[PDB]
Design a protein around this nucleic acid. Structure first.
Ligand SMILES: Nc1ccn([C@H]2C[C@H](O)[C@@H](COP(=O)(O)OP(=O)(O)OP(=O)(O)O)O2)c(=O)n1
Ligand SMILES: Nc1ccn([C@H]2C[C@H](O)[C@@H](COP(=O)(O)O)O2)c(=O)n1
Ligand SMILES: [Cl-]
Ligand SMILES: [Cl-]
Ligand SMILES: [Mg+2]
Ligand SMILES: [Mg+2]
Ligand code: NA
Ligand code: NA
Ligand code: NA
Length: 326
DNA sequence: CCGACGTCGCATCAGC
DNA sequence: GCTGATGCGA
DNA sequence: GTCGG
């Protein structure tokens, strides 16, 4: 990519601020700047050129000038040398280990993959599965495998109840040639914003996917959100496929458009779009778009009959999913 | 300057 | 048990 | 760390 050196540097700084500094707004700020630079269609020649972009300020402009001149950032070169920062950054790569647990583990002398495997009984369930599949979860999924997985989930969901609709969202719906995981939005006419006429709607689907050995593990599970692990079947004498992360979100059927907007993302796109809604006097979540009175209090949900209706309310031209990869 | 920064589901814990 | 943070995640 | 009133 045109400015990959810069965007990698800013991403590394973002991860430092999240995992080590525990400064979520600096993390979001660095990621917003990396994102706007990533889509900028010129090779950046100076910090001042970058500072014209929204989300790039004085400090990041100075880092860009240092990086352009020397190929590196002294602030990062030092962070890379700090053992405590290095340990925390590694531990947070395990699903279920966040910044707080990573610093506590380091305090307790658990700092390496070997240390984690020796101390399984100090991990909660989520973290224990994250460790089991540590290597697998850092591999990406070719779109060809995403298509095979789509076929399994959609056909198995149909076998439970033909009135279910499952929609693969996330980076897949944005047309990516590879995905970090699989994200599945689920609806059923029994579950609306007005009533739940049938229990176990998510459970029935998860159970079926476990029974055909597609879902292999569970990280967390409630009435509307499943977070877990899945795996494609391999043929005779084939090496097994990597285990993959899968998220399933059951959304009230009448709120599908807000749900699919949320679950298509990207995460940075949603933050930018929701922030723009706020400036326009609206609030968006995965269920509704609601006005804000002078109150600052959300009003009643507005009618939504398409994804584009949501963009229209906030005076944005419609963006196809493939153009939301921020 | 300085308050705001997207929004919410599930797991875990503390305090009653 | 319930409720309200807090952590971690989408 | 950046933005906007
Ligand atoms: N902090 C976050 C994280 C995620 N999401 C949303 C939008 C995402 O696109 C979606 C799925 O989360 P993923 O982490 O799976 O992100 P992607 O599917 O977009 O990318 P990847 O290829 O890494 O899975 O849920 C969000 O709104 N806010
Ligand atoms: N998971 C899904 C996907 C689509 N739908 C509905 C919402 C729309 O009325 C209709 C249009 O589908 P599509 O967006 O795939 O064109 O399908 C649903 O209820 N649940
Ligand atoms: Cl909707
Ligand atoms: Cl709502
Ligand atoms: Mg995904
Ligand atoms: Mg603002
Ligand atoms: Na700027
Ligand atoms: Na983690
Ligand atoms: Na996901």
């Amino acid at each position: 990519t045109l400015n990959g050196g810069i965007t990698d540097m800013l991403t590394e700084l973002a991860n430092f601020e999240k995992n080590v500094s525990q400064a979520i707004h600096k993390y979001n700020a660095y990621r917003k700047a990396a994102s706007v630079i990533a889509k900028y269609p010129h090779k950046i020649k100076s910090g001042a050129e970058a500072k014209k972009l929204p989300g790039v300020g004085t400090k990041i402009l100075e880092k860009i000038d240092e990086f352009l001149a020397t190929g590196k950032l002294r602030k990062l070169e030092k962070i890379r040398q700090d053992d405590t920062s290095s340990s925390i950054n590694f531990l947070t790569r395990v699903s279920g280990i966040g910044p707080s647990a990573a610093r506590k583990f380091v305090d307790e002398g658990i700092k390496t993959l070997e240390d984690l495997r020796k101390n399984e009984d100090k991990l909660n369930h989520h973290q224990r599965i994250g460790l089991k599949y540590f290597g697998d979860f850092e591999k990406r999924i070719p779109r060809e495998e995403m298509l095979q997985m789509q076929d399994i989930v959609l056909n198995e969901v149909k076998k439970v109840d033909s009135e279910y609709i499952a929609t693969v969202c996330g980076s897949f719906r944005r047309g990516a040639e590879s995905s970090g995981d699989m994200d599945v939005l689920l609806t059923h006419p029994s579950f609306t914003s007005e009533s739940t006429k049938q229990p176990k709607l998510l459970h029935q689907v998860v159970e079926q996917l476990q029974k055909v050995h597609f879902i292999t593990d569970t990280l967390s599970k409630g009435e509307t959100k499943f977070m877990g692990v899945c795996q494609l079947p391999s043929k005779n004498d084939e090496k097994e496929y990597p285990h993959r992360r899968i998220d399933i979100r059951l959304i009230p059927k009448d709120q599908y458009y807000c749900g699919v907007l949320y679950f298509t993302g990207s995460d940075i796109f949603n933050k930018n779009m929701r922030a723009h809604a706020l400036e326009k006097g609206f609030t968006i979540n995965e269920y509704t778009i609601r006005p804000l009175g002078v109150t600052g209090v959300a009003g009643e949900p507005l009618p939504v009959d398409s994804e584009k209706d949501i963009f229209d309310y906030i005076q944005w031209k419609y963006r196809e999913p493939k153009d939301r990869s921020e």
